[PDB]
Amino acid sequence: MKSVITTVVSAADAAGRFPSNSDLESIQGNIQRSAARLEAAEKLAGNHEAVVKEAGDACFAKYAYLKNPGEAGENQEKINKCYRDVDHYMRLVNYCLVVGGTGPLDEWGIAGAREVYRTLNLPTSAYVASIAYTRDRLCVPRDMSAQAGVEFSAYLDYLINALS
Amino acid sequence: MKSVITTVVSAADAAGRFPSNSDLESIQGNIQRSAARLEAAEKLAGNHEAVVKEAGDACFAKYAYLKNPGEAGENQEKINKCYRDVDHYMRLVNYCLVVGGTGPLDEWGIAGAREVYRTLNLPTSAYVASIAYTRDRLCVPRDMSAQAGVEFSAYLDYLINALS
Amino acid sequence: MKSVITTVVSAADAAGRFPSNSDLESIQGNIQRSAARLEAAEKLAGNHEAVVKEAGDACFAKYAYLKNPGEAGENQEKINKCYRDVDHYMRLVNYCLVVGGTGPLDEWGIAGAREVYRTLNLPTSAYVASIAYTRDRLCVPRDMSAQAGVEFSAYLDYLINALS
Amino acid sequence: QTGLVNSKFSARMAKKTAKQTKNKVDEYMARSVQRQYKQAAVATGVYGTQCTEGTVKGAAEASRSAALSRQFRIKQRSAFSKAHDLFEFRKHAIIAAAGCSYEEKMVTRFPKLAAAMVLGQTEMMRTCSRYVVPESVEEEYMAASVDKQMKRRGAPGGVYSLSCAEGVAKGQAEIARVSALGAAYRAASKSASAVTAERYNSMAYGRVHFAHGCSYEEQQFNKYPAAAAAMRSDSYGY
Amino acid sequence: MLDAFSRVVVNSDAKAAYVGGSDLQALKSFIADGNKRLDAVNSIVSNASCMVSDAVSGMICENPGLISPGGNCYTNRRMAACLRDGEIILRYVSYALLAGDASVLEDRCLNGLKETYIALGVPTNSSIRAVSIMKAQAVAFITNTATERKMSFAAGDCTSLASEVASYFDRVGAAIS
Amino acid sequence: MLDAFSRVVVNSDAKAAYVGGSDLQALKSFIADGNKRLDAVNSIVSNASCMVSDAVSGMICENPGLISPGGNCYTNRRMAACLRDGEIILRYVSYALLAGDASVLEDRCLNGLKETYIALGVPTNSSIRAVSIMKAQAVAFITNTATERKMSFAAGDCTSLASEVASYFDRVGAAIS
Amino acid sequence: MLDAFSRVVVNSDAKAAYVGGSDLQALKSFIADGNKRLDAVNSIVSNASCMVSDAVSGMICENPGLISPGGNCYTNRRMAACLRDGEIILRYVSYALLAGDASVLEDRCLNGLKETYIALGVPTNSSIRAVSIMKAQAVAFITNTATERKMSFAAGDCTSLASEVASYFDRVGAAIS
Amino acid sequence: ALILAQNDHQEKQYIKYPKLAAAALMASTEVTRACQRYAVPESIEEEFLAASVDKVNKMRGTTASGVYKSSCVEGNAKGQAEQARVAALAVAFRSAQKSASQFAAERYAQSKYGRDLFSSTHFEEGYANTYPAMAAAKRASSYGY
Ligand SMILES: C=CC1=C(C)[C@@H](Cc2[nH]c(/C=C3N=C(/C=C4\NC(=O)[C@H](C)[C@H]4CC)C(C)=C\3CCC(=O)O)c(CCC(=O)O)c2C)NC1=O
Ligand SMILES: C=CC1=C(C)[C@@H](Cc2[nH]c(/C=C3N=C(/C=C4\NC(=O)[C@H](C)[C@H]4CC)C(C)=C\3CCC(=O)O)c(CCC(=O)O)c2C)NC1=O
Ligand SMILES: C=CC1=C(C)[C@@H](Cc2[nH]c(/C=C3N=C(/C=C4\NC(=O)[C@H](C)[C@H]4CC)C(C)=C\3CCC(=O)O)c(CCC(=O)O)c2C)NC1=O
Ligand SMILES: C=CC1=C(C)[C@@H](Cc2[nH]c(/C=C3N=C(/C=C4\NC(=O)[C@H](C)[C@H]4CC)C(C)=C\3CCC(=O)O)c(CCC(=O)O)c2C)NC1=O
Ligand SMILES: C=CC1=C(C)[C@@H](Cc2[nH]c(/C=C3N=C(/C=C4\NC(=O)[C@H](C)[C@H]4CC)C(C)=C\3CCC(=O)O)c(CCC(=O)O)c2C)NC1=O
Ligand SMILES: C=CC1=C(C)[C@@H](Cc2[nH]c(/C=C3N=C(/C=C4\NC(=O)[C@H](C)[C@H]4CC)C(C)=C\3CCC(=O)O)c(CCC(=O)O)c2C)NC1=O
Ligand SMILES: C=CC1=C(C)[C@@H](Cc2[nH]c(/C=C3N=C(/C=C4\NC(=O)[C@H](C)[C@H]4CC)C(C)=C\3CCC(=O)O)c(CCC(=O)O)c2C)NC1=O
Ligand SMILES: C=CC1=C(C)[C@@H](Cc2[nH]c(/C=C3N=C(/C=C4\NC(=O)[C@H](C)[C@H]4CC)C(C)=C\3CCC(=O)O)c(CCC(=O)O)c2C)NC1=O
Ligand SMILES: C=CC1=C(C)[C@@H](Cc2[nH]c(/C=C3N=C(/C=C4\NC(=O)[C@H](C)[C@H]4CC)C(C)=C\3CCC(=O)O)c(CCC(=O)O)c2C)NC1=O
Ligand SMILES: C=CC1=C(C)[C@@H](Cc2[nH]c(/C=C3N=C(/C=C4\NC(=O)[C@H](C)[C@H]4CC)C(C)=C\3CCC(=O)O)c(CCC(=O)O)c2C)NC1=O
Ligand SMILES: C=CC1=C(C)[C@@H](Cc2[nH]c(/C=C3N=C(/C=C4\NC(=O)[C@H](C)[C@H]4CC)C(C)=C\3CCC(=O)O)c(CCC(=O)O)c2C)NC1=O
Ligand SMILES: C=CC1=C(C)[C@@H](Cc2[nH]c(/C=C3N=C(/C=C4\NC(=O)[C@H](C)[C@H]4CC)C(C)=C\3CCC(=O)O)c(CCC(=O)O)c2C)NC1=O
Ligand SMILES: C=CC1=C(C)[C@@H](Cc2[nH]c(/C=C3N=C(/C=C4\NC(=O)[C@H](C)[C@H]4CC)C(C)=C\3CCC(=O)O)c(CCC(=O)O)c2C)NC1=O
Ligand SMILES: CCC1=C(C)[C@@H](CC2=N/C(=C\c3[nH]c(C[C@@H]4NC(=O)C(C)=C4CC)c(C)c3CCC(=O)O)C(CCC(=O)O)=C2C)NC1=O
């Protein structure tokens, strides 16, 4: 679970050190920059059922071949399992904006993700087009504040760049 | 470049051993079974330009979504680079008919394929659809022998299984 | 302007009726077959100079007699008016793929064309040979999608039929 | 005179060039650090237990010429594999000499210094598979799972590499049999302070060279550091 | 490791005897059934990456407790770890049918694995339900009774090789129980 | 390894100087404008993973000899390594832009890289084009002139950061030539 | 490494070619004598331990400068190392003769073997003869014309394989020079 | 001689007296060691770049047909060709006995001899700056060899 506070202690444990003044300056980044990322994290959790349903069908409206038999979304319980997987990742962006790092993204949703989506024949283009629909449908003053929309977007396309 | 020769002289070199009668028994197996796969060699080598045409459109017949803008076959120039990629995989599977092992697949087509197809957003399920259209249309005493068909289909699934 | 919307309410007005529950189903067909006729239209918009350059000299490679004194393309103004009149026609083919019906063709391009081209001695068989050249120039996985070629080669041989 | 291509007989340019002077610095820099690393082995006047060459009378000189034949197989590596051994040993020496900019600038020039630091720092702190024995069959199978994964670099496509080979002559592998079990029992007969240094060295070794922020990888290493000291670099086929 | 042809040497050496025609009753029939064995081994490796996903997904629809939060297959780290070990255990039983003997299983895979999984938190109920799907899938390809893909063969019987691969799979089931 | 605040600490060590107010004026102009530098590093690394496929496939479509048979980007093993070192360089130029000085660039990546690319048989002039397209997109992403991607930033003049990363990309193009 | 089959692959890969019918006539004539090639190297390895002691003791009786005090075969180590790399170059020429190509020769044995013999001061003109004395022994054993060993072998022509191992030994003799 | 002349008087001396300029060019390549007889190449391909321009220098050592000229001869009496061979190898071993200052002087001055006398383009300026032994072997073509 890599955060700002975890990378400055794993370096000092590697060099066998007490936390010096350089490491104490890094936790200041979890003070004034921590205001915006704490704002967008609970605001995503306060609107979380609306972002998954209204982007989850926008993925399938792009990829209309998925309701064919022999594909993934042929029946209802696999389309309902699709809605759980978008709710998994928007919980993680809600998770990662709290802890300040890319911690819960990489330990849970990224490591090993390139093998499971290959073996279960799941298209990785539909995973990233679903989440990029949420990114370009961000109005800057209405979804969240101005600088939280930076940190909402910059944590979002890190999840794009891992699957793409 | 695995084959019958290059693995048993590799175990002979890793021990520092000499080619003994454990080792020469394997090349005698590459005299009986080699006559079957060489009978499928010139059948594909003379008729490769028609089997890549039948495998080419069957990639896009099963997947009409690739001709949409933004995806892999978005114009009729990137579609032309898709047909070369079936033609390369039809050429590497011709070389594994000759050497006996899956060397020209594993050295030349497999290693790194599960990185760049993810990086260039190339959907791997379209590649396994284009190979499997060739595989089920061996009416086995017309294309080749009964023995050559069970050998040539024994390399095509290795393109299926290493891409999935 | 015959389309799907401008025929179901030109019949709802001819009987003095409301928008029926019949006609709300016919616009549900406009939702489904749009993505094959929009993607066939957007492919024509970024490729128009290339496709009417090749369609126009298919008239003049075939019909070398048109540069004779008194014929249709006897000077450079008439050659420029020949390539204009096939630039207009495939612009209307681009228009019919947006409206979704055959409306913009038969009220801007076809109505009058029997009477205009007879009086000015412009041959119909040279107009057909340019449009029938690009009907079988279309390659099914390479240029556009599979069903997108069906929509694009429905308005083309509509125009070959209505001219002949 | 004219060059050796046309109309000449004897060999020339017999001169210490810029690269052989670079190479003669490179071997003396590599010989200096193992001298400092074997200084930590024989730290007192008496020798450590862990540098016996063999136990059989013929096993001493046969252990030399087998390991000396490994050094020629470094030289016999292909030009992709030589350049692969440059930049990972350049990377893992910044991990080894951790915070010192002088020590990391010196390893970005000299190349066999990088080949000498990453062996001896793993043998100063004895974080190799020859020095650690797992105590439990939980951890024995845990270390056998990672050692089976590291042997896949020896055989990438079913053909074993040059680096995987123990012997090059007849009867050389059976001498290599009796050394490693001799290295196993010498790893088992260590002192009360020796085996608990390795248990806290290796989970501190795997957390800096291979983990990089993953909570799952350190939690396996802090339960089983025998898998951590079986984690070697990507250069060697073994 | 051993195989079928060195299964006879490890029992005959205890009586220190030559291998005669009394010992050749099984191995002379082994090379008559050798091509059927190679035709069988080629069929298991053929659909093998789909065989793994046919095994782990059938275990999930049997028991949804592992996709529960805190269940042992919750994350992509934990799901791909038995997409990893779906093709470890399938690989050595492809080695076992090729060798004619399961001597490769208990010395590099099965020893210590039974007490391993209780300390990692891998549950013992679904691990039996992981391997038992691959038993029924294996005999669908030896006897070509797979109901949605057919493979080309020469006609004949394979009831010996069908029960032999399921006699290899329950050794994994007799291990981790 | 050194950075921008640590760039004048070693010029002050060569002349035994205490760091005085005439020298510190450039560093307070750095740290006041450093909030733009934070706003420009994430403009690259958010779009970095398609930027190498924007560049390496841009290198193929300009110079098609690489994907010819026998070429350096022909096989799937080699094209995996080229897309690897396309983003290895993009990892390090994002490092040196963030640190404010290029002292991380020519000791961990560019040092020894020229004779590495010579000995591998890599065509050097095509790797000039592979990093030139990454130069041409770096100043396109910084100034929001990227014509298919506009990210919202606080408005103001930002061409100094564009000229700083364009002064780092030709350090790659000159050290490997 | 490669073999004689995959040498035809890389000569057909660079011209983007499938192995056509005219190029299959070499490989079908290669496997027609595939019984002879296994019969050839089975004569060499069966007499291999005496062939090196035939070789390197034949150079002491040809030239006494190696057993001079201070010479290259003065030490019981240095004689044993001259035994040791006398059979390795026998071991690799038997690898290449079974493989039908010298693709194992120039990359597992002959890379840098010259300049490691330069750095010890190894007399190369003796090792020109020490390779070539095994060339005289290899052509006899492959033709069954050795004057102290007539082996049980089937009759027929084998002279092209005699020149094949003769075209392998001077390859070692060229790269030593 | 007109392009290494320092002043206007020295370029007037090299015009009127043709034996002065031919010995000026010879003495200019002794005060720096820009001859082939003192150039030792560093790398093996630097030797091969020297031999690539050395074969063109022997091509003017013949006539237009291919008869060997009288300029490039290497012996006059019997055994003098071996006497020229036994002596020039002792010169080339003395080429290897220079100091590190003398090697670094002639490395930077063989390029200066090559890039100011035999280059009107950019690619010969790149070859002179990179392989100084290639620039050292470009003779003046007043010599036959
Ligand atoms: C820890 C975080 C976490 C995830 C990221 C997902 C990842 C994930 N998805 C699936 C499994 C699945 N996931 C999907 C979802 C989709 N398939 C598609 O084609 C679309 C791209 C997408 C819907 C939009 C489907 C349809 C299945 C069923 C396929 C199967 O079970 O084999 C499974 C197997 C078990 C299961 O059914 O859940 C896992 C682990 N689950 C998690 O627990
Ligand atoms: C019981 C002990 C035990 C471990 C500690 C790990 C350690 C480990 N990791 C990798 C291998 C890897 N390890 C990672 C690391 C990660 N992947 C992620 O999703 C995270 C970001 C990060 C872990 C936190 C990656 C990306 C690879 C693939 C690189 C490769 O080896 O090819 C390998 C090589 C073979 C393999 O994949 O198993 C090993 C031994 N495996 C073990 O068996
Ligand atoms: C916490 C983060 C957060 C977000 C990311 C958004 C997320 C969001 N907003 C809307 C919903 C909306 N979003 C907008 C805003 C806009 N529409 C546009 O096309 C413009 C780009 C932009 C104006 C600046 C409007 C006008 C609606 C209502 C109409 C609609 O459904 O789009 C929807 C669809 C469901 C709904 O109607 O509510 C979603 C998921 N809201 C949030 O609270
Ligand atoms: C010798 C081994 C060898 C291979 C295995 C292939 C693999 C391969 N394919 C592509 C590259 C590509 N491959 C495709 C292929 C496809 N897109 C589709 O619609 C289908 C999914 C599929 C064809 C049926 C496309 C569209 C590109 C272009 C991607 C780009 O332009 O960036 C590239 C990048 C360079 C290039 O354009 O060639 C490589 C290495 N090429 C090789 O030389
Ligand atoms: C080089 C090796 C090689 C093969 C693997 C096959 C495969 C194959 N068959 C056909 C072409 C054909 N293939 C078949 C065969 C069949 N159709 C069916 O419905 C049955 C399942 C099956 C009987 C065995 C038929 C009937 C045609 C004629 C056109 C067609 O129907 O496709 C073509 C297109 C080119 C051609 O006409 O030859 C190819 C590549 N033929 C070959 O030459
Ligand atoms: C600090 C003091 C110091 C030493 C006492 C020596 C340690 C040392 N290493 C080896 C010998 C060896 N040492 C290694 C080294 C390793 N094996 C690996 O897989 C890892 C990469 C690495 C550290 C564990 C290898 C590969 C050999 C040859 C194989 C063998 O051990 O027989 C030998 C000969 C006897 C033996 O076989 O063990 C000795 C004494 N080096 C030193 O620097
Ligand atoms: C290199 C890889 C390699 C292979 C894949 C096999 C290929 C193979 N299979 C069989 C041959 C056979 N294989 C089977 C087996 C079966 N038949 C069925 O219908 C069942 C599904 C399955 C039972 C387990 C039978 C019954 C025969 C014919 C009898 C026999 O030859 O033993 C034969 C002998 C007949 C022939 O020459 O065609 C060969 C060469 N051998 C190899 O060397
Ligand atoms: C050398 C032999 C060898 C094997 C036989 C396999 C199997 C195997 N898997 C794991 C390790 C694991 N194995 C699983 C697998 C599962 N958990 C479940 O509930 C299901 C039964 C199953 C998937 C359906 C998981 C989830 C882990 C990781 C444990 C964790 O994250 O806590 C380990 C411990 C080492 C490690 O952590 O990687 C081993 C030996 N892998 C090997 O390397
Ligand atoms: C809830 C989820 C769920 C599943 C995923 C399947 C999983 C599954 N498949 C089979 C049974 C089988 N499963 C397969 C596997 C496959 N078939 C193929 O052709 C491919 C190669 C591969 C899918 C990738 C095969 C070949 C059989 C034998 C019957 C047959 O299909 O011919 C069985 C045993 C029958 C039983 O006991 O009920 C089960 C549980 N069933 C389920 O209830
Ligand atoms: C830490 C520093 C560091 C780097 C800078 C990179 C660069 C790099 N690339 C390669 C190795 C390679 N690099 C390339 C790349 C290219 N060849 C081309 O023609 C293109 C211009 C370019 C891609 C854009 C290729 C094709 C190989 C493989 C060569 C081969 O396999 O023959 C190697 C040798 C090791 C290996 O096999 O990968 C290194 C060090 N990797 C690193 O670790
Ligand atoms: C011959 C083949 C060929 C191509 C494949 C493209 C690729 C390409 N694009 C750009 C030029 C660019 N390339 C990108 C990169 C991207 N653009 C985006 O919208 C994404 C964010 C990202 C891919 C993921 C950007 C941002 C620019 C600047 C212009 C812009 O897109 O606004 C350049 C450099 C300048 C130029 O030549 O135009 C190249 C080579 N152009 C070609 O000539
Ligand atoms: C943790 C991550 C992290 C960041 C990404 C930055 C985010 C960031 N950028 C700016 C602020 C700014 N950013 C820019 C940058 C630009 N304007 C342009 O027109 C160009 C597109 C681009 C230059 C390349 C400018 C001009 C300002 C205002 C000046 C300033 O506040 O310094 C500000 C101050 C104003 C505000 O609160 O929004 C902040 C917090 N800081 C952080 O801590
Ligand atoms: C002064 C010392 C001295 C020697 C030791 C031999 C060494 C020697 N042997 C052979 C020639 C040979 N050498 C051998 C080798 C052997 N013969 C066998 O029967 C054994 C297998 C093995 C000895 C253990 C063989 C088989 C030949 C070919 C002729 C033959 O013996 O039939 C040749 C080349 C042909 C020749 O010129 O005679 C030489 C130089 N000759 C010498 O002048
Ligand atoms: C406990 C310490 C130890 C050992 C291990 C063995 C080493 C060893 N390897 C052998 C033989 C051998 N050696 C290797 C190389 C090496 N071995 C592998 O299993 C893999 C994957 C390798 C590359 C890294 C291989 C691959 C073989 C099998 C070759 C064969 O016999 O066919 C042989 C037999 C040689 C012969 O048959 O004459 C021995 C004795 N001895 C020891 O003292």
mmCIF file of N, CA and C and ligand atoms in Angstrom, chain G residues 47-63 129 132-134 136-141 144-150, ligand 13:
data_model
loop_
_atom_site.group_PDB
_atom_site.id
_atom_site.type_symbol
_atom_site.label_atom_id
_atom_site.label_comp_id
_atom_site.label_asym_id
_atom_site.label_seq_id
_atom_site.Cartn_x
_atom_site.Cartn_y
_atom_site.Cartn_z
ATOM 1 N N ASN G 47 34.565 -44.057 -29.111
ATOM 2 C CA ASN G 47 36.017 -44.094 -29.010
ATOM 3 C C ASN G 47 36.581 -42.749 -28.569
ATOM 4 N N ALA G 48 35.774 -41.934 -27.889
ATOM 5 C CA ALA G 48 36.137 -40.544 -27.648
ATOM 6 C C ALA G 48 37.171 -40.386 -26.546
ATOM 7 N N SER G 49 37.127 -41.237 -25.520
ATOM 8 C CA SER G 49 38.054 -41.114 -24.402
ATOM 9 C C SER G 49 39.465 -41.530 -24.780
ATOM 10 N N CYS G 50 39.605 -42.396 -25.779
ATOM 11 C CA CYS G 50 40.920 -42.753 -26.278
ATOM 12 C C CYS G 50 41.389 -41.825 -27.384
ATOM 13 N N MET G 51 40.465 -41.119 -28.042
ATOM 14 C CA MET G 51 40.809 -40.234 -29.152
ATOM 15 C C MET G 51 41.552 -38.989 -28.696
ATOM 16 N N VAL G 52 41.217 -38.466 -27.520
ATOM 17 C CA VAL G 52 41.925 -37.310 -26.982
ATOM 18 C C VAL G 52 43.306 -37.715 -26.495
ATOM 19 N N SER G 53 43.414 -38.897 -25.884
ATOM 20 C CA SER G 53 44.717 -39.403 -25.479
ATOM 21 C C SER G 53 45.525 -39.890 -26.675
ATOM 22 N N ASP G 54 44.857 -40.219 -27.782
ATOM 23 C CA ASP G 54 45.557 -40.372 -29.050
ATOM 24 C C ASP G 54 46.084 -39.038 -29.544
ATOM 25 N N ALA G 55 45.329 -37.972 -29.318
ATOM 26 C CA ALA G 55 45.623 -36.668 -29.884
ATOM 27 C C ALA G 55 46.744 -35.942 -29.168
ATOM 28 N N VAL G 56 46.579 -35.685 -27.875
ATOM 29 C CA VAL G 56 47.468 -34.753 -27.198
ATOM 30 C C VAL G 56 48.777 -35.428 -26.813
ATOM 31 N N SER G 57 48.788 -36.762 -26.726
ATOM 32 C CA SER G 57 50.053 -37.462 -26.572
ATOM 33 C C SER G 57 50.767 -37.594 -27.906
ATOM 34 N N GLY G 58 50.029 -37.471 -29.011
ATOM 35 C CA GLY G 58 50.650 -37.450 -30.322
ATOM 36 C C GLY G 58 51.318 -36.130 -30.646
ATOM 37 N N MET G 59 51.043 -35.091 -29.857
ATOM 38 C CA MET G 59 51.696 -33.813 -30.089
ATOM 39 C C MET G 59 52.968 -33.672 -29.275
ATOM 40 N N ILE G 60 53.055 -34.379 -28.151
ATOM 41 C CA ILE G 60 54.296 -34.412 -27.392
ATOM 42 C C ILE G 60 55.351 -35.206 -28.151
ATOM 43 N N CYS G 61 54.946 -36.318 -28.764
ATOM 44 C CA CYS G 61 55.853 -37.102 -29.589
ATOM 45 C C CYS G 61 56.140 -36.445 -30.930
ATOM 46 N N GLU G 62 55.327 -35.483 -31.350
ATOM 47 C CA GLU G 62 55.642 -34.704 -32.536
ATOM 48 C C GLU G 62 56.527 -33.511 -32.212
ATOM 49 N N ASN G 63 56.337 -32.891 -31.050
ATOM 50 C CA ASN G 63 57.103 -31.713 -30.653
ATOM 51 C C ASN G 63 57.379 -31.765 -29.156
ATOM 52 N N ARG G 129 47.792 -28.160 -35.032
ATOM 53 C CA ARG G 129 48.003 -29.583 -35.207
ATOM 54 C C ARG G 129 47.168 -30.415 -34.248
ATOM 55 N N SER G 132 43.928 -30.795 -35.793
ATOM 56 C CA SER G 132 44.017 -31.542 -37.042
ATOM 57 C C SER G 132 44.389 -33.003 -36.833
ATOM 58 N N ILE G 133 44.951 -33.356 -35.674
ATOM 59 C CA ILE G 133 45.199 -34.769 -35.408
ATOM 60 C C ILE G 133 43.880 -35.474 -35.103
ATOM 61 N N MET G 134 42.915 -34.749 -34.532
ATOM 62 C CA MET G 134 41.584 -35.307 -34.364
ATOM 63 C C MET G 134 40.792 -35.267 -35.656
ATOM 64 N N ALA G 136 42.230 -36.235 -38.459
ATOM 65 C CA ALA G 136 42.683 -37.493 -39.039
ATOM 66 C C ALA G 136 42.028 -38.694 -38.373
ATOM 67 N N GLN G 137 41.695 -38.586 -37.087
ATOM 68 C CA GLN G 137 41.032 -39.686 -36.402
ATOM 69 C C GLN G 137 39.542 -39.720 -36.696
ATOM 70 N N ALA G 138 38.945 -38.574 -37.019
ATOM 71 C CA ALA G 138 37.504 -38.536 -37.236
ATOM 72 C C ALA G 138 37.117 -39.060 -38.602
ATOM 73 N N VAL G 139 37.964 -38.858 -39.614
ATOM 74 C CA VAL G 139 37.640 -39.346 -40.948
ATOM 75 C C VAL G 139 37.802 -40.864 -41.025
ATOM 76 N N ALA G 140 38.649 -41.449 -40.177
ATOM 77 C CA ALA G 140 38.814 -42.894 -40.163
ATOM 78 C C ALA G 140 37.644 -43.595 -39.489
ATOM 79 N N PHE G 141 37.184 -43.067 -38.355
ATOM 80 C CA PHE G 141 36.080 -43.663 -37.614
ATOM 81 C C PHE G 141 34.749 -43.504 -38.321
ATOM 82 N N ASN G 144 35.055 -46.234 -41.097
ATOM 83 C CA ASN G 144 35.482 -47.535 -40.552
ATOM 84 C C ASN G 144 36.818 -47.983 -41.144
ATOM 85 N N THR G 145 37.710 -47.021 -41.373
ATOM 86 C CA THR G 145 39.010 -47.268 -41.983
ATOM 87 C C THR G 145 40.138 -47.095 -40.977
ATOM 88 N N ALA G 146 39.791 -47.080 -39.695
ATOM 89 C CA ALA G 146 40.774 -47.001 -38.628
ATOM 90 C C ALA G 146 41.565 -48.301 -38.541
ATOM 91 N N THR G 147 42.890 -48.205 -38.339
ATOM 92 C CA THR G 147 43.654 -49.446 -38.498
ATOM 93 C C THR G 147 43.749 -50.283 -37.225
ATOM 94 N N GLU G 148 42.982 -49.974 -36.178
ATOM 95 C CA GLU G 148 42.910 -50.853 -35.015
ATOM 96 C C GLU G 148 41.490 -51.097 -34.526
ATOM 97 N N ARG G 149 40.477 -50.694 -35.285
ATOM 98 C CA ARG G 149 39.096 -50.873 -34.855
ATOM 99 C C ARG G 149 38.199 -50.936 -36.078
ATOM 100 N N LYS G 150 37.715 -52.130 -36.392
ATOM 101 C CA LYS G 150 36.708 -52.322 -37.423
ATOM 102 C C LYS G 150 35.390 -52.634 -36.736
HETATM 103 C C1 LIG I 13 54.911 -40.003 -31.854
HETATM 104 C C2 LIG I 13 53.729 -40.424 -31.444
HETATM 105 C C3 LIG I 13 52.588 -40.655 -32.366
HETATM 106 C C4 LIG I 13 51.208 -40.999 -32.013
HETATM 107 C C5 LIG I 13 50.530 -41.218 -30.690
HETATM 108 C C6 LIG I 13 50.330 -41.153 -33.180
HETATM 109 C C7 LIG I 13 49.228 -40.109 -33.155
HETATM 110 C C8 LIG I 13 48.483 -40.170 -34.463
HETATM 111 N N1 LIG I 13 47.499 -41.051 -34.738
HETATM 112 C C9 LIG I 13 47.063 -40.831 -35.984
HETATM 113 C C10 LIG I 13 45.979 -41.674 -36.537
HETATM 114 C C11 LIG I 13 44.949 -42.339 -35.712
HETATM 115 N N2 LIG I 13 44.945 -42.206 -34.362
HETATM 116 C C12 LIG I 13 43.893 -42.945 -33.919
HETATM 117 C C13 LIG I 13 43.540 -43.028 -32.467
HETATM 118 C C14 LIG I 13 43.515 -44.207 -31.805
HETATM 119 N N3 LIG I 13 43.755 -45.381 -32.360
HETATM 120 C C15 LIG I 13 42.974 -46.289 -31.798
HETATM 121 O O1 LIG I 13 42.705 -47.384 -32.258
HETATM 122 C C16 LIG I 13 42.438 -45.777 -30.498
HETATM 123 C C17 LIG I 13 40.927 -45.623 -30.544
HETATM 124 C C18 LIG I 13 43.121 -44.430 -30.378
HETATM 125 C C19 LIG I 13 44.319 -44.614 -29.463
HETATM 126 C C20 LIG I 13 43.888 -44.834 -28.027
HETATM 127 C C21 LIG I 13 43.133 -43.576 -35.035
HETATM 128 C C22 LIG I 13 41.912 -44.445 -34.998
HETATM 129 C C23 LIG I 13 43.860 -43.177 -36.254
HETATM 130 C C24 LIG I 13 43.535 -43.563 -37.682
HETATM 131 C C25 LIG I 13 44.307 -44.807 -38.157
HETATM 132 C C26 LIG I 13 43.995 -46.101 -37.414
HETATM 133 O O2 LIG I 13 44.454 -46.229 -36.260
HETATM 134 O O3 LIG I 13 43.334 -47.041 -37.956
HETATM 135 C C27 LIG I 13 47.768 -39.734 -36.679
HETATM 136 C C28 LIG I 13 47.573 -39.170 -38.065
HETATM 137 C C29 LIG I 13 47.980 -40.166 -39.144
HETATM 138 C C30 LIG I 13 49.455 -40.459 -39.080
HETATM 139 O O4 LIG I 13 50.247 -39.600 -39.516
HETATM 140 O O5 LIG I 13 49.824 -41.555 -38.604
HETATM 141 C C31 LIG I 13 48.717 -39.287 -35.647
HETATM 142 C C32 LIG I 13 49.712 -38.173 -35.799
HETATM 143 N N4 LIG I 13 51.235 -40.894 -34.323
HETATM 144 C C33 LIG I 13 52.473 -40.618 -33.850
HETATM 145 O O6 LIG I 13 53.445 -40.352 -34.647
#
